[PDB]
């Protein structure tokens, strides 16, 4: 319902609220299915590379999948 109502948001805050809602939906997916969570994580990272929680969660999921074989990514994020 929040995503449906996002169409009525003022354009100034529309980008920020869309990013927030997509992050929340990606969290719900990560609870349900990690693949869609990672997809939305990539979508938001392309949309806003400056956000940290998205990158943290994406790298954390990658480390879970790669058994901590992305130490370079963690160092770069640090």
């Amino acid at each position: 319902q929040s995503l449906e109502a996002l169409n009525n948001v003022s354009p100034q805050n529309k980008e920020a609220l869309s990013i927030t809602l997509h992050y929340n939906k990606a969290r719900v997916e990560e609870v349900s299915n990690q693949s869609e969570a990672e997809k939305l994580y990539s979508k938001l990272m392309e949309k806003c590379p400056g956000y940290t929680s998205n990158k943290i969660r994406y790298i954390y999921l990658l480390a879970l999948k790669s058994n901590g074989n992305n130490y370079a990514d963690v160092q770069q994020l640090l």
Binding site: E15, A16, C48, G50, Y51
Partner: peptide
Amino acid sequence: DDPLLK
């Protein structure tokens, strides 16, 4: 520096 991030 991004007003969007702020």
